[PDB]
Swiss-Prot record:
The keyword Cytoplasm is annotated on this UniProt entry: yes
GO terms of biological process kind: bile acid catabolic process; lipid catabolic process
Residues the entry annotates as binding 3'-phosphoadenylyl sulfate: 42-46, 119, 127, 182, 216-221, 239-241
Function: Hepatic sulfotransferase involved in the maintenance of bile acid homeostasis and energy balance. Catalyzes the transfer of sulfonate group from 3'-phosphoadenylyl sulfate (PAPS) to the 7-alpha hydroxy group of primary bile acids to form 7-monosulfate derivatives in the pathway of bile acid elimination. Displays high catalytic efficiency toward cholate, chenodeoxycholate and their glycine and taurine conjugates.
Protein name in the entry: Sulfotransferase 2A8
Result after altering I231S: Increases sulfotransferase activity
Name of encoding gene: Sult2a8
Length: 274
């Protein structure tokens, strides 16, 4: 079995259960002062996690060097993390990968802050292809064009990227959530991190801001991270981290097919972010 089907959504086989998903959706309370990072896989989740954690530490890498992403911002749906986050007081820093139909319903009646990271779905496809083939054995790997077809038909972890992205950015103009793109993070870096500083209320000044940028660059973040693969292919999430790698993978035919499927599965989607 490639996936575990929970609420009509394909999940990874390990780390997730239906009962937990249901509980998280129906009973986990999102408290007004909470702040949650919500992404789709291979959109730059580790990058944004590190962005936020370096903003909070004002550039001091020590925390992100000593810890992994799930220790800093525990994923709500991940494992039995909900027990921990329920049995914890104060303002909580959490993360998530679910589409809105599975996000905790309580959040829709609160001023909890949510940062939604989006990426060009083609680069998302490419990053996922490389990462999921990254450490499988040659015979058991997935050829490019069948992974491409599976992505276009929603046979991907946490369901269709189109449904996920559409449902999440349909709430964009709410005050308590803001969307931002991996491309924005890659080229309009300083403006973007200052905007998320505004949104999170975290005050940060000169020097510390230069520190954050330097520490969030791909190269030295990669050196940091290679310093632990119990639940991730630790060696393999830092691939090359540019924008537009899909042009090196998509044939013209595949690009036209992708644009077509994008235009009926996400007709109500403007690409101003990319
Ligand atoms: C196991 C699964 C697929 C890996 C595979 O193809 O074998 C991978 C793909 C997306 C991953 C998740 C994403 O990387 C986001 C989270 C990052 C944290 O560092 C670990 C938990 C975290 C929630 C990851 C858990 C697990 O490693 C995931 C769920
Ligand atoms: C994530 C963890 C929560 C464990 C707990 O108390 O339940 C706690 C333990 C120590 C915390 C850190 C320490 O409190 C020191 C830092 C100062 C501020 O509290 C926020 C960032 C700061 C870097 C914290 C980040 C995070 O909240 C930490 C790392
Ligand atoms: N500091 C960083 N700066 C720029 N891009 C980064 C980055 N860290 C990771 N990326 C890229 O974000 C992708 C993985 O995202 P996620 O955390 O959701 O798995 C990868 O894309 P690529 O495979 O295209 O290189 C990764 O290289």
């Amino acid at each position: 079995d490639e996936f575990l089907w929970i609420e009509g959504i394909p999940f990874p086989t390990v780390y997730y259960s239906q009962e937990i998903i249901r509980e998280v959706r129906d009973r986990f309370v999102v408290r007004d002062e909470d702040t949650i990072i919500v992404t789709y896989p291979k959109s730059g989740t580790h990058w944004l996690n590190e962005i936020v954690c370096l903003i909070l530490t004002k550039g001091d890498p020590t925390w992100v060097q000593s810890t992994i992403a799930n220790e800093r911002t525990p994923w709500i749906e991940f494992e039995n993390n909900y027990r921990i986050l329920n049995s914890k007081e104060g303002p909580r820093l959490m993360a998530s990968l679910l589409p809105i139909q599975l996000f905790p319903k309580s959040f829709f009646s609160s001023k909890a802050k949510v940062i939604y990271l989006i990426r060009n779905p083609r680069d998302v496809l490419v990053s996922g292809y490389h990462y999921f083939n990254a450490l499988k054995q040659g015979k058991e790997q997935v050829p490019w064009k069948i992974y491409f077809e599976n992505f276009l038909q929603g046979k991907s972890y946490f369901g269709s990227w189109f449904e996920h992205a559409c449902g999440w950015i349909s709430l964009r103009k709410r005050e308590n959530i803001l969307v931002l793109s991996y491309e924005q993070l890659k080229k309009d870096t300083r403006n973007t991190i200052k905007k998320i500083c505004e949104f999170l209320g975290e005050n940060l000044e000169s020097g510390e801001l230069e520190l954050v940028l330097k520490n969030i660059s791909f190269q030295i973040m990669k050196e940091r991270m290679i310093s632990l693969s119990n639940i991730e292919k630790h060696e393999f999430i830092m691939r090359k981290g540019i924008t537009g790698d899909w042009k090196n993978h998509f044939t013209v035919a595949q690009a036209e097919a992708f644009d077509k499927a994008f235009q009926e599965k996400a007709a109500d989607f403007p690409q101003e972010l990319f």
